[PDB]
Nucleic acid binder design. Structure first.
Lengths: 59, 56, 72, 51, 9, 102, 53
RNA sequence: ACUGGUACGGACAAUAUCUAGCGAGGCUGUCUGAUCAGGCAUUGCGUAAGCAGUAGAGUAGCCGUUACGAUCUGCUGAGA
């Protein structure tokens, strides 16, 4: 249960920085196996890894 | 400072009808409050049918 | 369902540590009568370290949760 | 690797006597059972464990 | 002295 | 000049959690033409056929504004967390349930 | 009818309180509803308390 | 297209201690889309919310009259 590399890969794949990625806390076992960017893309498509929206704050 | 302006001083309560210049006097001052409460309640009840429905 | 008066328990505590200490109070509280839900932690920290209000309403089962009430 | 004095002096877990608060203590490490760093500029300060 | 209060009615 | 917007409310209606007539009433009572509510001067017309709501407008009207009115109506009925206003084609929309685990 | 008005006031206060409760301090990133998934028990309870079939 | 400077009338302006381990109510600014309610600015420096009145500076409909609305009174020595 060490998903640091998975978070970095998800941030790089989605291109939204590590402050915008959301790894499913109930899917640690599945995310732990995603050591490749193809697996990260599959997880993002599956909805396990989600990209957060930009903060709704008036300019 | 002006005592007649501050609400807690007896001068203000005497110069504004709050204090007699005793229980009957206060009851006389507070006549019709029940009617105002009833009208507010009626308006609030008739202005929110959906909330009444969810209540049921 | 209990009512905690954290105004009395946090009296005299430094204002930089009021919110964390309340967390230790509630854990103590449930120990006097009987794990805190993250919603309860959110309710505690709803206003920062200079946060916790005078009174809170909790439900203790021990698992302690905040409840939705108009006023306490 | 544990203090010799504290282990020699050894319910305690959940609660050589200089500057001890009134004298008893609760040494958890003893119950459960070389280095050097520069300070004051150049001056050598060797700290050693006491097993 | 205070008179009649709201609660006392 | 006239533009037509279609809302498909079949999926929530067949489940018995939605009333298209109330939605049409909300629209006709909240279109706010020219900044004034109830200023429908035949510029905007709303029709409710039971499963499809049709809004035909010659005034300033946009898909975003229809979406906003529908979302406000959903929030008023507190169905915002379950019903979603989505688009299928250009200026053709529908209401769909959010993802639910069986 | 004055019981119903009191209940309306109580529910309005409760709704305002829960709106404040869900609202937070300085705005953060939002997780969209379309990307997350909810269970069926919560939906059933909500649709029952709303008064639907 | 609906920008401004003008002369005028009236107020400003410079830390030590023990333990586990190691070890020689109001105001100014600002943010929550606006009220209500709060956060911050090293306490920054006594009549609640809501609603009503036909009273009400002013915005907006006609040559007796839509709508909005600062401020004032009542509910209220109330509320906390």
């Amino acid at each position: 249960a060490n998903l640091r590399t998975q978070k970095r890969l998800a941030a790089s794949v989605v291109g939204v920085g590590k402050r915008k990625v959301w790894l499913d806390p109930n899917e640690t076992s599945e995310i732990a196996q995603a050591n490749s960017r193809n697996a990260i893309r599959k997880l993002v498509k599956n909805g396990t890894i989600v990209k957060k929206a930009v903060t709704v704050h008036s300019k | 400072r002006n005592p007649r302006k501050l609400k807690w001083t007896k001068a203000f309560r005497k110069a504004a009808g709050k204090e007699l210049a005793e229980r009957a006097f206060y009851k006389n001052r507070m006549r019709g409050n029940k009617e105002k409460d009833f009208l507010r309640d009626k308006k609030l009840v008739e202005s929110n049918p959906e909330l009444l429905r969810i209540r049921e | 369902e209990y009512t905690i008066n954290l105004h009395k328990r946090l009296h005299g505590v430094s204002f930089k540590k009021r919110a964390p200490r309340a967390v230790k109070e509630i854990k103590k509280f449930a120990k006097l009568h009987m794990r805190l839900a993250p919603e309860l932690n959110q309710a505690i920290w709803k206003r920062g370290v200079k946060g916790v209000e005078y009174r809170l309403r909790l439900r203790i089962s021990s698992y302690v949760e905040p409840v939705l009430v108009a006023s306490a | 690797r544990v203090s010799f004095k504290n282990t020699r002096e050894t319910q305690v877990l959940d609660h050589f006597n200089s500057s001890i608060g009134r004298k008893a203590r609760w040494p958890a490490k003893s119950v459960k059972f070389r280095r050097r760093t520069y300070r004051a500029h150049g001056r050598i300060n060797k700290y050693e464990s006491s097993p | 002295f205070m008179g009649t209060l709201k609660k006392d009615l | 000049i006239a533009k037509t917007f279609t809302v498909d409310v079949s999926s929530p209606t067949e489940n018995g959690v939605f009333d298209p007539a109330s939605y049409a009433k909300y629209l006709i009572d909240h279109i706010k033409v020219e900044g004034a509510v109830g200023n429908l001067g035949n510029a905007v017309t709303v029709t409710e056929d039971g499963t499809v709501v049709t809004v035909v407008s010659t005034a300033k009207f946009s898909g975003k504004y229809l979406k906003y009115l529908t979302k406000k109506y959903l929030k008023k009925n507190q169905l915002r967390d379950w019903i979603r206003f989505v688009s299928t084609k250009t200026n053709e929309y529908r209401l769909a349930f959010y993802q639910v685990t069986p | 009818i004055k019981e119903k008005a009191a209940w309306i006031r109580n529910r309005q206060k409760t709704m305002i309180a829960e709106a404040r409760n869900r609202k937070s301090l300085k705005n953060k990133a939002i997780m969209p509803r379309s990307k997350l998934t909810k269970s069926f028990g919560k939906m059933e309870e909500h649709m029952s308390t709303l008064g639907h079939d």
